[PDB]
Amino acid sequence: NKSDAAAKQIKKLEEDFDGRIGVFAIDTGSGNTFGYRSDERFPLCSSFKGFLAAAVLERVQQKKLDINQKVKYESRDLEYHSPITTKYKGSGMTLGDMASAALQYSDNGATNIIMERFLGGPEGMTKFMRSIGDNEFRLDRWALELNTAIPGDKRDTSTPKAVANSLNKLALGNVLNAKVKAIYQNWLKGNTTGDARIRASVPADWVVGDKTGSCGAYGTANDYAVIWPKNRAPLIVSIYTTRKSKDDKHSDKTIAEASRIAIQAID
């Protein structure tokens, strides 16, 4: 009942914003879930940057990479939206600081430097997700270029369910050991780009780690989060949206509200 009604409200909400809404939410304590269009495909936009940071952490843990190892890139033509990498181009950055920048500011230069040098490009990123049991995720193109969000293009997409399940595994599961897991979780908590999304949907005394995506086209934006309520078990929330026309703008309020609705469903 609480699930069917929840679904009606998501459906009216996508009708109000003239697009498509995908939701998957998990209560990790009760194992309750709620899903709407959770197995439909949606562009990742920047959101894969959250999974990229975890990939780096897995390498670190197998001692293939040092978190403090220096990354130099002073001759690189930096991608658009490299707010962090741009400032430090002259000195370079630690891998840790680069990886966290890719997540916490969605830095394109950080994302792409990491993917060229450490992770084996998009396909290596895809391989990483496969290796944790995620069979929907696919990364086809590099950061920035992948944000075309052309309707019916399956490149650089996943599903809300798969995103939630992957996030669950990485943020709360046993893919990462206790140490590098805790670094991952802190990274997520310190995200700077999602105050108007899942974060706006929860009491302020709840702790959230999230990663957003905003393609800048077809009104395509997303957010995914781990939520540590007070006096309650962690939640996972995964919110993916598209709109009909190229010049449709994304809707933060729609994500926020879908998040409220989703959380009600699993309460």
Ligand SMILES: *C(=O)[C@H]([C@@H](C)O)[C@H]1C[C@@H](SCC/N=C/N)C(C(=O)O)=N1
């Ligand atoms: C990924 O989705 C984006 C693309 C340019 O690679 C980046 C850009 C930011 S948009 C910041 C929100 N709006 C600001 N005015 C972004 C993100 O929001 O996650 N990732």
